[PDB]
């Protein structure tokens, strides 16, 4: 279940996005929050975000939809198969160099963040990033 205190906690979070206290979260309102925390998202990104959480398709997120998403948990398999995209020839391992380059230059991550990543996975140098280990750690 969710707890009485938990539901309160989520209501707080929801209000931090819902600037106009009108019971829903717009793209503009989410963009505002994100820009407030120093990000420069495209309205494309904001729409994609809202669509992942918008159930009834009204274009805004209501509180039900919000606590549905906060309560969302197969994802192990998805993340494992993501690492496979970079697995030279189905090793099971990824070179830490390859991991770092992907993690920094492709996609979304900082050198510090990736240092944490590699430090949480490598078994000395040898056993270069066994991604099965990553996937299990995250789940």
């Amino acid at each position: 279940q969710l707890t009485e205190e938990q539901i309160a906690e989520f209501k707080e979070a929801f209000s931090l996005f819902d600037k106009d206290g009108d019971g829903t979260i717009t793209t503009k309102e989410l963009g505002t929050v994100m820009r407030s925390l120093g990000q420069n998202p495209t309205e494309a990104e904001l729409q994609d975000m809202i669509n992942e959480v918008d159930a009834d398709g009204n274009g805004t997120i209501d509180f039900p939809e919000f606590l549905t998403m906060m309560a969302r948990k197969d994802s192990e398999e998805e993340i494992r198969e993501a690492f496979r995209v970079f697995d030279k020839d189905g090793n099971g391992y990824i070179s830490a160099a390859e991991l770092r380059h992907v993690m920094t230059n492709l996609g979304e991550l900082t050198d510090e963040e990736v240092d944490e990543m590699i430090r949480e996975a490598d078994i000395e140098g040898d056993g270069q990033v066994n991604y099965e280990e990553f996937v299990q750690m995250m789940t």
């Binding site: 994100m34 996609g107 991550l109």
Partner: protein, 63 residues
């Protein structure tokens, strides 16, 4: 191809898992908020989570 979709899912997942460390490197990135406070961390987590799900859909479209 699915190289950027792949990467954004691993990255997205990790910043989620890492945010749950009250003391991760992941936190440093937010360089416009002087000292990170409660509500800051709340909105952050909310957003990382939301990005997770987006990356999870985009990768499902690529798989």
């Amino acid at each position: 191809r699915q190289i950027p979709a792949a990467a954004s899912l691993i990255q997205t997942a990790w910043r989620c898992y890492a945010a749950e460390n009250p003391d991760s490197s992941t936190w440093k990135i937010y360089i416009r908020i002087s000292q990170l406070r409660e509500h800051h961390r709340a909105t952050i987590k909310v957003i990382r989570r939301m990005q997770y799900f987006v990356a999870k859909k985009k990768f499902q479209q690529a798989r």
